Amino acid sequence: MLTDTQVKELISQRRWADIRRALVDEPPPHLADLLFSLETREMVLVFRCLPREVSSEVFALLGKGDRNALIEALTDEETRHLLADLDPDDRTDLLQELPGEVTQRLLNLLSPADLKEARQLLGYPEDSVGRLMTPDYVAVRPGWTVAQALDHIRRRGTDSETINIIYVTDDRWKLLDALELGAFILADPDAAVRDIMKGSFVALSAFDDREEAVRVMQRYDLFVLPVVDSTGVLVGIVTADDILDVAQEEATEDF
Amino acid sequence: MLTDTQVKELISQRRWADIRRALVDEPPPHLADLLFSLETREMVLVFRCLPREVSSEVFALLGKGDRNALIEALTDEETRHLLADLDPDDRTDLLQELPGEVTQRLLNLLSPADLKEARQLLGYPEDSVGRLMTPDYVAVRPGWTVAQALDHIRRRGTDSETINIIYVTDDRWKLLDALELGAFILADPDAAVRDIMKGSFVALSAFDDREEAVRVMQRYDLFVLPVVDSTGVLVGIVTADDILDVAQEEATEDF
Numbered sequence: 406m407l408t409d410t411q412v413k414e415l416i417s418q419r420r421w422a423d424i425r426r427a428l429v430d431e432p433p434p435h436l437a438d439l440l441f442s443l444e445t446r447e448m449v450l451v452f453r454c455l456p457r458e459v460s461s462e463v464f465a466l467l468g469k470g471d472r473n474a475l476i477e478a479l480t481d482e483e484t485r486h487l488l489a490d491l492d493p494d495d496r497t498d499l500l501q502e503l504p505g506e507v508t509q510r511l512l513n514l515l516s517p518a519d520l521k522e523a524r525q526l527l528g529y530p531e532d533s534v535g536r537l538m539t540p541d542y543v544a545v546r547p548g549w550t551v552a553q554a555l556d557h558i559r560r561r562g563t564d565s566e567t568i569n570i571i572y573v574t575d576d577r578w579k580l581l582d583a584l585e586l587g588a589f590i591l592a593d594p595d596a597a598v599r600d601i602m603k604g605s606f607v608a609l610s611a612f613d614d615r616e617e618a619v620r621v622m623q624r625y626d627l628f629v630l631p632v633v634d635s636t637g638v639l640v641g642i643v644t645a646d647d648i649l650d651v652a653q654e655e656a657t658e659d660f
Numbered sequence: 661m662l663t664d665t666q667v668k669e670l671i672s673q674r675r676w677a678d679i680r681r682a683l684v685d686e687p688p689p690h691l692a693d694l695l696f697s698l699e700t701r702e703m704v705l706v707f708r709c710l711p712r713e714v715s716s717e718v719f720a721l722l723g724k725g726d727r728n729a730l731i732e733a734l735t736d737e738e739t740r741h742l743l744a745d746l747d748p749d750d751r752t753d754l755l756q757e758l759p760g761e762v763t764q765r766l767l768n769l770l771s772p773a774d775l776k777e778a779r780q781l782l783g784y785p786e787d788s789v790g791r792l793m794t795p796d797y798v799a800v801r802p803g804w805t806v807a808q809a810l811d812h813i814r815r816r817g818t819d820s821e822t823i824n825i826i827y828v829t830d831d832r833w834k835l836l837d838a839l840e841l842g843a844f845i846l847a848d849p850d851a852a853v854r855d856i857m858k859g860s861f862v863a864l865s866a867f868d869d870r871e872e873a874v875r876v877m878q879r880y881d882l883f884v885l886p887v888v889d890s891t892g893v894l895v896g897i898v899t900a901d902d903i904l905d906v907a908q909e910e911a912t913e914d915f
């Protein structure tokens with residue numbers, strides 16, 4: 406419960422260790438509130454005090470002004486480190502909102518694989534599902550056993566957007582099913598994944614409009630939706646937290 | 661992919677078995693679409709053909725007119741069976757929208773424990789979180805081991821709204837934490853639940869406005885939120901599918 410007043414005094418006293426200790430374990434939304442209530446110079450300073458695992462989350466929560474100001478201020482390495490750790494859809498959201506030359510130097514701060522990822526995601530139309538989606542889903546093969554699937558989920562879990570739905574893909578990565586995480590812990594560990602499939606699923610197109618993601622998510626009452634290309638290959642997922650934001654970006658735009 | 665045309669012919673032929681076979685494994689939203697495109701007499705007839713485990717889901721998806729017409733038409737036992745199987749928040753949604761004497765005979769069709777449940781949930785203010793919430797969450801004790809928690813989740817899973825977040829409560833059922841299901845499958849089965857708690861959580865009040873559920877869910881990017889009473893006792897949960905509906909009931913009401 407550290408206030409704008411207490412941080413600004415600690416800054417004035419150059420009590421940098423006390424600041425970093427005071428920021429430990431604060432929820433990212435609460436850190437985003439503090440950074441907003443600060444003035445630009447101190448907001449930039451407190452942001453750099455954060456561990457990079459925290460500051461990437463907080464960055465995604467900031468307003469456009471604070472976000473843009475913060476981009477105008479961090480160094481090349483600090484920026485490079487934010488772009489690496491941002492979730493791919495959050496990385497896209499920044500690049501579509503920034504001016505061209507700024508997005509372009511940002512792009513040059515990405516690693517080759519991250520450049521290819523970011524290039525692909527910005528390449529879907531604006532207001533498309535492809536541009537809302539993240540490729541950090543967890544997928545399993547139909548021929549794996551449930552125990553093997555569970556070891557894959559455990560290895561890959563925290564590095565991924567969500568594990569609450571697990572996707573099944575074939576060898577050519579085409580989407581076969583969408584399974585709740587619970588199905589794997591209710592099932593017999595020696596059963597194949599194919600034993601717990603129903604073979605029916607809802608999926609979006611990457612070229613769907615963002616509002617279709619809202620309509621489809623309301624229709625089927627799911628918290629995550631897979632996105633497939635024209636051949637049925639799984640290319641990413643969209644999650645309910647981002648879809649709720651779309652619902653009220655689109656709602657106010659109607660007003 | 662059974663159409664309004666094919667069902668109406670089967671009805672005219674009195675091919676009731678063929679109808680029940682044609683409805684097997686159709687997603688509830690697709691059944692709700694078919695029932696809407698029908699006329700009232702056939703919609704009521706096809707609804708009764710459904711297994712009660714299906715028809716309860718479909719009922720929650722229907723429009724107010726079709727829903728109300730269907731209440732005017734099912735028998736006392738058929739109504740009794742719908743009210744039992746409806747999720748408690750979906751049961752509330754029907755009772756707050758129906759006229760008084762109709763809600764009152766409905767109430768008399770409930771079992772004692774279901775009457776006490778429904779009475780309590782309608783007793784929160786209209787437009788409150790209490791009236792959005794369902795008590796069908798899954799909770800564990802902090803002193804249980806992860807293996808014991810996992811057996812409780814398995815016993816209680818499909819009878820509950822979601823298992824994607826598991827709540828920790830003490831002996832007096834006060835909320836101690838909110839844990840992702842993944843935490844239990846990553847953890848050592850012999851660890852206590854208290855070993856995987858962080859002891860911090862977001863919770864709503866039952867007397868919060870429905871729009872606060874929207875604001876809090878957007879703020880913390882969660883798919884489920886617990887609801888606590890003034891003493892901190894867990895009383896229910898709200899889920900993102902219902903909150904997305906609130907967001908656009910409230911959005912259009914602004915327009």
Ligand SMILES: [Mg+2]
Nearest residue numbers: 465491492495
């Ligand atoms: Mg994110």
Ligand SMILES: [Mg+2]
Nearest residue numbers: 532614615616
């Ligand atoms: Mg548009």
Ligand SMILES: [Mg+2]
Nearest residue numbers: 493519522541
């Ligand atoms: Mg990555």
Ligand SMILES: [Mg+2]
Nearest residue numbers: 623624626901
């Ligand atoms: Mg819905």
Ligand SMILES: [Mg+2]
Nearest residue numbers: 492494644647
């Ligand atoms: Mg996201």
Ligand SMILES: [Mg+2]
Nearest residue numbers: 655656658659
């Ligand atoms: Mg519009």
Ligand SMILES: [Mg+2]
Nearest residue numbers: 720746747750
């Ligand atoms: Mg429901």
Ligand SMILES: [Mg+2]
Nearest residue numbers: 787869870871
């Ligand atoms: Mg209101």
Ligand SMILES: [Mg+2]
Nearest residue numbers: 748774777796
């Ligand atoms: Mg019940």
Ligand SMILES: [Mg+2]
Nearest residue numbers: 646878879881
């Ligand atoms: Mg949010």
Ligand SMILES: [Mg+2]
Nearest residue numbers: 747749899902
């Ligand atoms: Mg519900």
Ligand SMILES: [Mg+2]
Nearest residue numbers: 910911913914
């Ligand atoms: Mg309003």
